[PDB]
């Protein structure tokens, strides 16, 4: 039947968040709290349009907002964050429990400088 | 003699597993959930005789999702033409298809 | 269908052919019958996995259980027959005719 | 007396100790001096595959931090 | 003791799942962009390969419906290198 | 066998059939068939005999092969359709395989061979159960899939069943084997109209069940398994053999007995579908069934064979067992032709 | 190793020919153990870890071990291999030849059709691109038997219990 | 490097079995007021080497095997399965990490049973088959109870992953939670390996090398089963930075359990087949079923359902 | 009376089924094993033969 | 590939040892024991098979009991608990039947 | 009375079975008579295996939390206390 409509490569090129999984997991809780609105909007789009070719722009905003989130960390809490993710990186399962001391350090600075409050359980 | 005691007593004993579009544990979607949903919704109460012809398109697409026979045929044709071109030296697989260019995250 | 599905279905066909064409021992026929059950298990498992029929991943297990039950039955019949005759030869089952 | 058995038990103990130590050391040596990551579920493997792409050397052990961004 | 320990483990599991949920939208965005990129590359190279082929509508949907259909492994990594295909198919299963 | 255990096994057979007739999922239907087989083998071997063991083994082998083919067909239909409901099968090859399996379970020729042997091996009670209750589940499955049933294959199997049943019955002398071959022929009659009208199959099935119940119960009451052993019955209880004569004539289908109803309605439905050659051949071949029924009636009651001296002692004693259903079954299997318009109730 | 699944399926067919040739029971039982192990490998390759270990633990571990138990206690046979007397040897060779013809008609000719349509493309294509997250689809669905499939549990359990009863009644003499 | 890991798992286990022979000899002797091998090498350290060299030089006699083919496969299967069962075991990090390692172990033990059947059947010896079938019967009963106990104890682990057992027993050893199951499990392990009192003294047709390999496989299975018991019940502390601590503690636990295996061997008279099965069918099995009920109900009634992941 | 109503030459020799569904016991070979307690056996102390 | 490698290495190692134990040690010449396997000629007791069929059925029921650890994560805890207890009760009932009736003769 | 003697006789002769019946019986009665069973259900539901798909705000959903972490929405404080 019809020709599959596919977006051009140019319109799907976005600056990628080139961090490791351990780095993402260390800042995962804060990332969700800070970037909640853009992430939730994109999820709603993909869960209503049900087509990746309709929510490409929303995906871009998520990446851009994610980059801004890490940009603030670098300019305010660079050293404590490095300690946190490095500890998580070592653990094969990337367990949070093994790095609770480092987490407290990163949470404390981020609470003081950036004012971010880590989301609680559930 | 399908004594539909299930519907008479309003008890589900095996209807949960009849289709893959039914509720699955932890809301894990089926591979062809959308196609099966479309086919079932099309052929609801219109009768098997009418469903066989009227909802033919839905079932055809559903079967294509289930077995991917036509998709496999198309991909095989593409592969055959590509290999023929390679043998004649009329095609060069691009570096990203060769893996030279790093993938996107 | 993928070639793997073809091979499994062909395996079922071969086992059925062996079962229907007895040679001497009834034990060999039972082996062919159980092989067919194995082939059906593999076929159903692959189909369910590929379709992501999550709620139907329990079908192969139920098939396996009932398969081994009917086998327990076959073996019990085989030993009764062997104890009566002395061997499990299919030719021994000849009292009933037509 | 009874302590004469201890030599043989010690030799067997060293023999049994070799495997676990070898496994741990080889894991760390081949996984960038870190505990070998586990993939019990697809999400964990997806993180590994993403990490492999992020590294740029097709190795998941090397991890890129904030220095890689911007 | 096992009751208390298991309850704490459940709390930690919920925390880990929340971290996964927080990171999921970014991964979904990357996944969709990557899939579409691979599909486009395959489309362009398909045009180049089978342009000579008579009566070949490049990138013609095999389904009648215009609904988005999640691509199969062949539709994404069909013309990729064998090592990449092996990874995308059996990497997780063979990784032990 | 302990009576409680026997009751549990009988209920298990019934529950398997009920599951087959109650389920909407193919897997559950196959499960019901497996339960039927599992609970049927011990019932067949209630009276431990080498012949009983041979019959059980043959029955198990045939039913196991049938179940294997049935599950294979179900799996193929799942592969090509992703459906588990017992509806129109969406793969022709699966349809053919399932038809073969269900016919083997029924005993339709050319899968008839096991039926006479197993029937002869097992007891009269087990024979009754095998030839009446075990016919319900496969017929139910066939009725549910009648739309998808290939008319050509089913008609061929049914016609061959009628022919082979008649021929085999002509040569038999053992009462159980005669009953088995007649059962094959009647199953052919039942399945002939399956592609056309299922309600007629239900009607024929009910009449066949009543007739076979009456015949088997009369045989049990007379405790006879051969033509001569039944011939001796006239000296002791003439009523039983005369009622047997009536039931045999009904089984032949001679009007105005009940046996005419199923044949009459079947011919009606087949002629409505523009099929004239097939029903004509069916009746002309059922004449053979009538022939062996008439031979049995001759030996039993229409004529009197010599008896033995020991019969005098048996004259003094009276049968203690009382089969409550037998009178009603005899009446319903002989005088019900004035009640055909009740066919609508089946619909 | 892109066609590993196809190789396994061919070996599965070969083992099925081996035990379907009805050889000496001991040799056949092996023809089935080998095929069973291969089939488990195929299921694992598709990702059914639990089901793969199911056949290994139950079918191969118990069902075929009790089968071997019987062959050992009731041993009234002259041992022979699959490549023994022509009755078994010819059958094995012919089955292998039929399988090889199917394979050649399947690989050299992409659209092979004997009774069903088959495509010569590697089975890796049929695999679907998807993520289950922190899930084991197979395990979750099978565990749902206790939650969703209560009716299946009831029927299967009753069948098992009545099976024990039936086995005793049959093997009481 | 992975092949190096495989070799560093296989070779040390075989050497450990070889020295376990000497350890058993000496332990039994000193429990009998005797000195085990003490002449062949210092403290008998060269005794296993002497035994191996003598065996691989003794004239191998042929046992008229009905099927050399099968008679040769049985040793291969036993040894290969024994070696494979060590792979999933977490010494803190396992060689091959399986989400269902426990079921893999159970399946491997189940296949091992075939070695017994194949050996006796191919031996062409009435007494051999009888004894083999007795072994089949013994291993038959152990598998049921072993599986039930393993399932029940893993109901608090949260999965079949072997590595998770370390985390579950991080604070308290599992035995303190399931000690009756531990007792039945240990006795079932004794039954599995036919270690006394579940021996059937009086595959003997195997000569020298073949016998030696069967002996090695059996003793490797002994060590592996004791290791499994250790991981299941006697949890060990694991520091992610220094795994050697866990390795040492685990090895010590396994050695203690093997020493208990020998200690039982020279403490109790051998059972009788009827008694062994009237244990593994009429004493253990009902208790295992009841305890399985308890270990299903307990996590739910105490809100202690372990994490799935 | 007979196996079949119209018998053939081969079927003529064939015997009608027994009156009771009980086919006669065939051979009735004893399965009682005759084991020998070989002297080498430990319990025999090397000098004991127990035909059992 | 790792697990396949482990299986291959183990099997090959075992087979190599079997080679060096079946064919290498028999190379050494040890005269010839001209000793024939003097054979001059069946305990198919149910006592063995019964142990086997009952094991098969109990193993089948054990197979149904395997998915229990993952089944504890279901929200419908009451229903799952009831079904698990039902399966265990049926196992106990099967054992009781055999014990009460003429079974467990082993 | 008579039952009490039977239990004593049973434990004297077949203690293993008596224990098995008791443990099995408690493993059935105790679950229903336990308050933590309700909690065990809640914990299983609480565990967020899959993503909480957001819903489009229509302006008439006060209870539904349109924010990262504010009072609206479910609370896991009960588990934290446990």
3-class secondary structure for chain B? CCCCHHHHCCCCCCHHHCCCCCCCHHHCCCCCHHHHHHHHHHCCCCCHHHHHHHCHHHHHHHHHHHHCHHHHHHHHHHHHHHHHHHHHCCCCCCHHHHCCCCCCC
**Chain E residues touching H158 at Cβ < 8 A:** 9
Strand G117-119 and strand I50-51: the pairing is unpaired
> For residues H29 and H17, what is the distance between their CA atoms, to the nearest angstrom?
18
Q: Do chains C and F have 3 or more beta-carbon pairs under 8 angstroms?
A: yes
> For residues J71 and H158, what is the distance between their CA atoms, to the nearest angstrom?
10
Report CB contact under 8 Å: G47, E93. yes
Specify which residues G112 forms β-bridges with.
G118
Report CB contact under 8 Å: B28, C59. no
Hey, is J78 helix, strand or coil? helix
The domains of chain J are located at: 1-101
The closest CB to that of F53, out of C12, C81, C98, belongs to: C81
Helix (H) or strand (E) holding C3: helix C3-20
Q: Are I36 and I26 in contact (CB under 8 A)?
A: no
Placement of tokens 């060999």 in the chain: C28
**Chain B residues touching F202 at Cβ < 8 A:** 1
The closest CB to that of H303, out of E1, E7, E9, belongs to: E7
Burial group, residue E54, by CB count within 10 angstroms (0-12, 13-18, 19+): exposed
> For residues F328 and K54, what is the distance between their CA atoms, to the nearest angstrom?
68
Domain that holds residue G34: 4-172
Report CB contact under 8 Å: A18, B105. yes
**Chain A residues touching E24 at Cβ < 8 A:** 43
Q: Do chains G and J have 3 or more beta-carbon pairs under 8 angstroms?
A: yes
- Please check whether residue A100 touches H, CB under 8 A: no
| Cα three-residue angle I34-I36-I38, rounded to 5 degrees | 170
- Please check whether residue J2 touches K, CB under 8 A: no
> How many angstroms separate the CA of residue E77 from the nearest CA in chain G?
9
Residue C53 C-beta-side C-alpha neighbours within 13 Å: 26
**Chain B residues touching G141 at Cβ < 8 A:** 24-25, 28
Q: Are A24 and A73 in contact (CB under 8 A)?
A: no
- Please check whether residue J105 touches G, CB under 8 A: no
User: What are the phi and psi torsion angles at F72 (to 5°)?
Assistant: -60, -45
> For residues K10 and K13, what is the distance between their CA atoms, to the nearest angstrom?
5
Strand I36-37 and strand G117-119: the pairing is unpaired
Residue H112: how many other CB atoms lie within 10 Å? 24
Q: Gap positions in chain K, given as the residue before each gap (C–N > 2.5 A)?
A: none
| Cα three-residue angle A14-A15-A19, rounded to 5 degrees | 130
C-interface mutation test, from G31, G70, G105, G114, most C Cβ less than 10 A away: G70
Helix (H) or strand (E) holding H240: none
Peptide bond into G168 cis (omega under 30): no
Specify which residues F226 forms β-bridges with.
F174
Token digits for G10? 């061919």
Burial group, residue B10, by CB count within 10 angstroms (0-12, 13-18, 19+): exposed
Nearest alpha-carbon partner for G156 in C62, J97, F14, B17: C62
Helix (H) or strand (E) holding G119: strand G117-119
- Please check whether residue D69 touches H, CB under 8 A: no
> Which residues, in sequence order, are CB contacts of F127 under 8 Å at separation 6+?
F119, F176, F179, F180, F216
Report CB contact under 8 Å: A122, K67. no
Sign of torsion over alpha carbons H243, A21, D69, D64 = positive
> How many angstroms separate the CA of residue K54 from the nearest CA in chain E?
12
SS3 sequence of G152-168: HHHHHHHHHHHHHHHHH
- What does CATH list as the number for J1-101? 1.20.58.1610
- Please check whether residue G131 touches D, CB under 8 A: yes
The closest CB to that of F24, out of B18, B32, B63, belongs to: B18
**b vs e for G81-99, b when ≥16 Cβ sit within 10 Å of the residue's Cβ?**
bbebeeebbebbeebbeeb
> For residues F236 and F318, what is the distance between their CA atoms, to the nearest angstrom?
10
Token digits for H180? 């009756």
User: What are the phi and psi torsion angles at I41 (to 5°)?
Assistant: -50, 130
Placement of tokens 């055999």 in the chain: J98
- Please check whether residue A18 touches B, CB under 8 A: yes
Q: Are F75 and F91 in contact (CB under 8 A)?
A: no
Placement of tokens 């539709």 in the chain: E75
Residue J4: how many other CB atoms lie within 10 Å? 14
Instruction: Supply the CATH number for residue G166's domain.
Output: 1.20.120.1200
- Please check whether residue A40 touches K, CB under 8 A: yes
Report CB contact under 8 Å: H103, G50. yes
Q: Are H132 and H117 in contact (CB under 8 A)?
A: yes
- Residue C25 is given by DSSP the state B
> For residues B61 and J76, what is the distance between their CA atoms, to the nearest angstrom?
36
> How many angstroms separate the CA of residue B14 from the nearest CA in chain K?
25
Placement of tokens 């206390």 in the chain: K81
Token digits for F128? 């009754």
Helix (H) or strand (E) holding B24: none
User: What are the phi and psi torsion angles at G119 (to 5°)?
Assistant: -110, 135
Token digits for C15? 């086992």
Q: Are F111 and F41 in contact (CB under 8 A)?
A: no
Domain that holds residue C62: 3-92
Specify which residues F76 forms β-bridges with.
none
Helix (H) or strand (E) holding G111: strand G111-113
- What's the count of helices (H) and strands (E) in chain G, helices before strands? 7, 2
> For residues F240 and F232, what is the distance between their CA atoms, to the nearest angstrom?
12
Q: Gap positions in chain H, given as the residue before each gap (C–N > 2.5 A)?
A: 202
> Which residues, in sequence order, are CB contacts of E70 under 8 Å at separation 6+?
G128, G129, G130
User: What are the phi and psi torsion angles at F301 (to 5°)?
Assistant: -125, -35
Chains that touch K (3 or more CB pairs under 8 A): A, B, E, G, H, J
Sign of torsion over alpha carbons H135, H141, H144, H146 = negative
Report CB contact under 8 Å: K67, A121. no
> For residues E30 and I5, what is the distance between their CA atoms, to the nearest angstrom?
84
**How far, CA to CA in Å, does G75 sit from each of A67, C33, J42, J44?**
75, 20, 8, 9
> For residues A69 and A116, what is the distance between their CA atoms, to the nearest angstrom?
11
Report CB contact under 8 Å: I23, C95. yes
> How many angstroms separate the CA of residue K73 from the nearest CA in chain E?
15
> For residues F205 and F214, what is the distance between their CA atoms, to the nearest angstrom?
14
Token digits for H226? 């004791």
Does some domain include residue C77? yes
Q: Gap positions in chain G, given as the residue before each gap (C–N > 2.5 A)?
A: none
Strand G111-113 and strand G117-119: the pairing is antiparallel
Does some domain include residue C97? no
User: What are the phi and psi torsion angles at F191 (to 5°)?
Assistant: -80, -15
> Which residues, in sequence order, are CB contacts of G94 under 8 Å at separation 6+?
none
- What's the count of helices (H) and strands (E) in chain C, helices before strands? 3, 0
> Which residues, in sequence order, are CB contacts of G26 under 8 Å at separation 6+?
G68, G71, G79, H67, H70, H118, H121, H122
Nearest alpha-carbon partner for F125 in F43, F206, F237: F43
Residue count of chain D, please give it: 70
Instruction: Supply the CATH number for residue C83's domain.
Output: 1.10.287.3510
Hey, is D59 helix, strand or coil? coil
**How far, CA to CA in Å, does I35 sit from each of A99, F173, H126, I32, I52?**
71, 51, 10, 10, 5
- Please check whether residue G17 touches H, CB under 8 A: no
Token digits for F199? 């309600």
Beta strands in chain J (DSSP E): none
User: What are the phi and psi torsion angles at D36 (to 5°)?
Assistant: -60, 125
Nearest alpha-carbon partner for C19 in H304, H54, J26, F104: F104
- Residue B102 is given by DSSP the state P
- Please check whether residue D38 touches G, CB under 8 A: no
Token digits for C93? 């089952």
How distant is the alpha carbon of residue H272 from its chain centre? 21
Token digits for D62? 């090397």
Token digits for B89? 């030296």
Specify which residues E72 forms β-bridges with.
G128
Placement of tokens 């050319």 in the chain: F110
What's the reported resolution, in angstroms, to a tenth? 3.2
Residue H304: how many other CB atoms lie within 10 Å? 22
Q: Are F210 and F333 in contact (CB under 8 A)?
A: yes
| Cα three-residue angle F18-F134-F250, rounded to 5 degrees | 115
Token digits for F59? 């029955």
Token digits for H137? 């019967």
Hey, is I49 helix, strand or coil? coil
Token digits for F217? 């119960």
Cβ under 8 Å to E: H residues 165-194? 167-168, 170-172, 176-177
- Residue E77 is given by DSSP the state H
Sign of torsion over alpha carbons I19, I21, I27, I30 = negative
> For residues H276 and I3, what is the distance between their CA atoms, to the nearest angstrom?
53
Burial group, residue H32, by CB count within 10 angstroms (0-12, 13-18, 19+): exposed
Q: Are F38 and F52 in contact (CB under 8 A)?
A: no
Hey, is C2 helix, strand or coil? strand
| DSSP states of H52-89 | HHHHTTSPPPP---TTHHHHHHHHHHHHHHHHHHTTT-
- Please check whether residue H202 touches I, CB under 8 A: yes
> For residues K50 and E28, what is the distance between their CA atoms, to the nearest angstrom?
13
Beta strands in H222-266 (DSSP E): none
Q: Are G18 and C16 in contact (CB under 8 A)?
A: no
Nearest alpha-carbon partner for F154 in F201, F197, F188: F188
**Chain A residues touching K76 at Cβ < 8 A:** 120-122
Report CB contact under 8 Å: D50, E91. no
> How many angstroms separate the CA of residue H183 from the nearest CA in chain K?
14
Hey, is C51 helix, strand or coil? helix
> For residues H146 and H123, what is the distance between their CA atoms, to the nearest angstrom?
29
> For residues K53 and C24, what is the distance between their CA atoms, to the nearest angstrom?
64
User: What are the phi and psi torsion angles at H177 (to 5°)?
Assistant: -95, -30
**How far, CA to CA in Å, does G170 sit from each of C77, F44, F53, G74, J55?**
7, 10, 9, 18, 16
C-alpha radius of gyration, chain D, whole number: 20
**Chain H residues touching K16 at Cβ < 8 A:** 283, 286-287
Nearest residue in chain F measured CA to CA from I8: F171
> For residues E91 and E72, what is the distance between their CA atoms, to the nearest angstrom?
16
Does some domain include residue C13? yes
**How far, CA to CA in Å, does F273 sit from each of F146, F195, F203, F279?**
15, 10, 18, 11
Hey, is F102 helix, strand or coil? helix
Alpha helices in A35-77, H assignment, sequence order: 36-48, 56-76
- Please check whether residue C65 touches J, CB under 8 A: yes
Q: Are F262 and F214 in contact (CB under 8 A)?
A: no
Nearest alpha-carbon partner for F216 in F129, F146, F147, F276: F129
Residue B7: how many other CB atoms lie within 10 Å? 11
> Which residues, in sequence order, are CB contacts of F29 under 8 Å at separation 6+?
F19, F20, F23, F86, F141
**How far, CA to CA in Å, does I44 sit from each of A21, F275, I39, I48?**
73, 86, 5, 5
> For residues K71 and K50, what is the distance between their CA atoms, to the nearest angstrom?
22
> For residues H224 and H89, what is the distance between their CA atoms, to the nearest angstrom?
9
- Please check whether residue G115 touches F, CB under 8 A: yes
Q: Do chains B and H have 3 or more beta-carbon pairs under 8 angstroms?
A: no
Chains that touch D (3 or more CB pairs under 8 A): A, B, E, G, H
Helix (H) or strand (E) holding K36: helix K36-46
Nearest alpha-carbon partner for I1 in F252, F235, F306, F117: F306
**Chain I residues touching J45 at Cβ < 8 A:** 31
As for how many domains chain C has, the answer is 1
**Chain A residues touching E61 at Cβ < 8 A:** 1-4
- Please check whether residue G61 touches H, CB under 8 A: yes
Alpha helices in chain A, H assignment, sequence order: 21-26, 28-34, 36-48, 56-76, 78-90, 100-112
């Amino acid at each position: 039947p019809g020709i599959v409509e596919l977006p051009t490569l140019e319109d799907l090129k976005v600056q990628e968040v080139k961090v490791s999984s351990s780095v993402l997991k260390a800042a995962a809780h804060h990332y969700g709290a800070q970037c909640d609105k853009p992430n939730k909007e994109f999820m709603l789009c993909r869960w209503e349009e049900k087509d990746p070719r309709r929510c490409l722009e929303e995906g871009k905003l998520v990446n851009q907002c994610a980059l801004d989130f890490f940009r603030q960390i670098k300019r305010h809490c660079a050293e404590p964050f490095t300690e946190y993710w490095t500890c998580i990186d070592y653990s094969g399962l990337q367990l949070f429990r093994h790095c609770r001391k480092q987490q407290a350090k990163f949470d404390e600075c981020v609470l003081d400088k950036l004012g971010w409050v880590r989301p609680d359980l559930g | 003699p399908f004594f539909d005691v299930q519907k008479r007593l309003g008890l589900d004993l095996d209807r949960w597993m009849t289709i893959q579009s039914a509720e699955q544990p932890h809301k894990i979607p089926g591979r062809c959930h959308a196609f099966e949903k479309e086919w079932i919704e099309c052929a609801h109460g219109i009768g098997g005789i009418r469903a066989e012809k009227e909802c033919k398109i839905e079932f055809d697409d559903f079967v294509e999702c289930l077995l991917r026979q036509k998709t496999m045929k198309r991909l095989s044709a593409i592969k055959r033409q590509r290999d023929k071109l390679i043998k004649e030296g009329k095609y060069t697989p691009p570096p990203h298809h060769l893996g030279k260019e790093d993938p996107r995250p | 269908m993928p070639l793997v599905y073809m091979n499994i279905i062909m395996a079922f066909a071969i086992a059925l052919a062996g079962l229907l064409m007895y040679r001497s021992h009834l034990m060999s026929s039972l082996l062919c019958l159980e092989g067919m059950m194995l082939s059906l298990f593999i076929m159903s498992t692959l189909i369910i996995l590929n379709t992501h029929f999550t709620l139907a991943n329990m079908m192969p297990i139920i098939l396996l259980v009932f398969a081994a039950c009917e086998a327990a039955l076959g073996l019990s019949l085989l030993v009764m027959v062997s104890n009566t005759y002395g061997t499990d030869y299919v030719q021994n089952l000849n009292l009933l005719q037509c | 007396m009874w302590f004469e058995i201890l030599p043989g038990i010690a030799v067997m103990a060293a023999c049994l100790f070799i495997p676990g130590m070898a496994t741990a050391h080889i894991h760390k040596f081949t996984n960038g001096g870190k505990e070998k990551r586990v993939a019990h579920f697809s999400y964990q493997w997806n993180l590994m595959e993403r990490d492999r792409c992020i590294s740029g050397v097709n190795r998941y052990h090397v991890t890129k931090g904030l220095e890689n961004i911007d | 003791s096992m009751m208390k320990w298991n309850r704490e483990r459940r709390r930690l599991q919920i925390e880990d799942f929340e971290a996964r949920i927080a990171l999921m939208p970014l991964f979904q965005a990357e996944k969709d962009r990557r899939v579409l990129q691979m599909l486009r590359e395959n489309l362009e190279e398909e045009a180049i390969i089978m342009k000579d082929v008579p009566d070949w509508k490049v990138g013609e949907s095999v389904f009648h419906t215009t609904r988005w259909v999640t691509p199969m492994m062949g539709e994404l990594y069909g013309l990729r290198t064998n090592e990449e295909i092996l990874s995308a198919t059996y990497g997780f299963i063979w990784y032990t | 066998m302990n009576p409680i255990i026997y009751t549990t096994l009988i209920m298990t057979v019934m529950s398997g059939t009920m599951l087959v007739m109650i389920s909407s999922h193919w897997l559950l239907i196959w499960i019901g068939f497996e339960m039927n087989l599992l609970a049927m083998i011990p019932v067949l071997m209630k009276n431990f005999n080498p012949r009983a063991t041979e019959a059980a083994t043959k029955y198990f082998l045939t039913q196991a092969t049938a179940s294997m083919m049935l599950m294979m067909a179900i799996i193929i239909n799942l592969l090509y359709s992703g459906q588990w409901t017992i509806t129109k099968m969406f793969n022709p090859v699966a349809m053919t395989m399932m038809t073969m399996a269900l016919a083997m379970k029924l005993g339709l020729s050319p899968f008839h061979f096991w039926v006479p042997e197993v029937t002869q091996g097992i007891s009269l009670q087990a024979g009754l159960l095998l030839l009446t209750w075990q016919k319900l589940a496969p017929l139910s499955v066939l009725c549910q899939i009648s739309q998808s049933i290939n008319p050509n294959l089913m008609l061929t199997m049914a016609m061959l069943s009628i022919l082979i049943g008649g021929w085999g019955g002509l040569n038999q002398t053992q009462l159980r084997k005669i009953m088995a071959y007649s059962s094959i022929a009647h199953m052919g009659w039942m399945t002939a109209v399956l592609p056309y009208n299922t309600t007629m199959t239900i009607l024929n099935l009910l009449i066949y069940i009543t007739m076979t119940l009456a015949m088997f119960m009369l045989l049990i009451h007379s405790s006879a398994t051969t033509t001569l052993s039944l011939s001796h019955t006239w000296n002791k209880m003439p009523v039983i053999t005369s009622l047997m004569m009536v039931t045999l004539l009904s089984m032949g289908g001679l009007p105005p007995l009940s046996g005419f109803m199923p044949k009459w309605m079947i011919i009606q439905e087949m002629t409505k579908n523009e099929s004239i050659i097939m029903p004509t051949l069916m009746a002309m071949t059922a004449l053979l069934n009538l022939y062996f029924y008439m031979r049995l009636a001759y030996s039993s009651s229409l004529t009197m064979f010599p008896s033995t001296n020991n019969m005098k002692m048996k004259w003094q004693f009276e049968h203690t067992k009382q089969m409550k259903l037998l009178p009603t079954m005899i009446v319903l299997s002989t005088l019900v032709l004035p009640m055909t318009p009740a066919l609508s109730s089946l619909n | 190793t892109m066609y590993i699944a196809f190789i396994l399926s061919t070996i599965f067919v070969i083992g099925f020919v081996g035990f379907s040739s009805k050889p000496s029971p001991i040799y056949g039982g092996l023809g089935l153990i080998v095929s069973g192990g291969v089939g488990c490998g195929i299921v694992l390759n598709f990702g059914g870890s639990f089901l793969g270990l199911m056949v290994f633990l139950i079918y191969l571990g118990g069902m075929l071990v009790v089968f071997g138990y019987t062959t050992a206690m009731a041993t009234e046979m002259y041992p022979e291999v699959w490549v023994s007397n022509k009755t078994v040897f010819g059958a094995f060779v012919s089955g292998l030849m039929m399988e090889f013809c199917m394979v050649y008609y399947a690989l050299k000719e992409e659209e092979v059709e004997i009774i069903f349509k088959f495509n010569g493309l590697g089975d890796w294509v049929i695999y679907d691109t998807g993520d289950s997250g922190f899930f084991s689809e197979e395990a979750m669905g099978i565990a749902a038997l206790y939650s969703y499939g209560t009716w299946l549990v009831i029927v299967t359990g009753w069948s098992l219990l009545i099976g024990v009863v039936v086995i005793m009644e049959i093997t009481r003499g | 490097m992975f092949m190096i890991n495989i070799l560093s798992l296989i070779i040390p286990i075989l050497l450990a079995v070889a020295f376990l022979t000497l350890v058993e000899r000496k332990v039994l002797g000193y429990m009998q007021l005797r000195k085990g091998p003490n002449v062949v090498g210092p403290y008998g350290l060269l005794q296993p080497i002497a035994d191996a060299l003598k065996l691989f030089t003794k004239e191998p006699l042929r046992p008229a095997t009905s099927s050399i083919s099968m008679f040769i496969i049985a040793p291969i299967l036993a040894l290969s399965l024994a070696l494979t069962m060590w792979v999933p075991l977490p010494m803190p990090y396992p060689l091959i990490n399986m989400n269902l390692g426990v079921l893999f172990m159970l399946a491997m033990s189940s296949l091992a049973v075939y070695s017994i059947l194949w050996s006796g059947w191919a031996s062409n010896s009435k007494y051999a088959l009888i004894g083999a079938l007795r072994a089949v019967a013994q291993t038959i009963s152990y598998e049921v109870t072993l599986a039930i106990i393993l399932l029940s104890v893993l109901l608090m682990n949260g999965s079949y992953t072997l590595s998770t057992l370390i985390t579950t027993q991080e604070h308290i050893w599992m035995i303190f939670t399931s000690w009756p199951l531990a007792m039945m499990w240990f006795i079932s392990t004794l039954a599995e390996t036919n270690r006394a009192p579940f021996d059937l003294t009086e595959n003997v047709e195997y000569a020298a090398g073949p016998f030696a390999m069967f002996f090695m496989a059996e003793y490797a299975n002994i060590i592996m089963m004791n290791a499994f018991t250790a991981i299941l019940f006697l949890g060990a502390s694991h520091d992610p930075h220094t795994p050697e601590l866990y390795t040492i503690n685990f090895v010590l636990k396994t050695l203690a359990l093997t020493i208990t295996f020998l200690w039982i061997r020279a403490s109790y008279p051998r059972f009788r087949y009827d008694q062994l099965m009237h244990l593994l069918w009429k004493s253990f099995l009902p208790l295992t079923l009841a305890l399985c009920m308890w270990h299903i109900s307990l996590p739910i009634m105490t809100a202690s359902i372990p994490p799935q992941s | 009376g007979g196996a079949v109503m119209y018998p053939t030459k081969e079927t003529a020799h064939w015997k009608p089924p027994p009156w009771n569904d009980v086919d006669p016991p065939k051979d009735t070979l004893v399965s009682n094993l005759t084991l020998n307690f070989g002297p080498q056996h430990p319990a025999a102390h090397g000098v004991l033969r127990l035909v059992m | 590939m790792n697990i396949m490698l482990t299986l291959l290495t183990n099997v090959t190692l075992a087979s190599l040892l079997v080679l060096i134990a079946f064919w290498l040690p028999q190379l050494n010449a040890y005269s010839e024991k001209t000793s024939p396997y003097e054979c001059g000629f069946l305990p198919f007791s149910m006592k063995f098979f019964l142990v086997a069929i009952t094991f098969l059925l109990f193993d089948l029921e054990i197979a149904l009991l395997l998915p229990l650890p993952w089944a504890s994560q279901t929200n419908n805890l009451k229903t799952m608990l009831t079904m698990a207890l039902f399966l265990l009760i049926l196992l106990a009932a099967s054992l009781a039947y055999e014990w009460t009736q003429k079974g467990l003769e082993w | 009375g008579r039952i009490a003697s039977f239990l004593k006789n049973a434990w004297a002769k077949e203690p293993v079975l008596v224990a098995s019946f008791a443990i099995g019986g408690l493993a059935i009665i105790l679950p229903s008579l336990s308050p933590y069973t309700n909690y065990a259900i809640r914990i299983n539901r609480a565990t967020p295996y899959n993503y909480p798909v957001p819903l489009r705000d229509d302006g008439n959903m006060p209870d539904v939390p349109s924010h990262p972490q504010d009072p609206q929405g479910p609370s896991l404080e009960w588990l934290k206390n446990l």
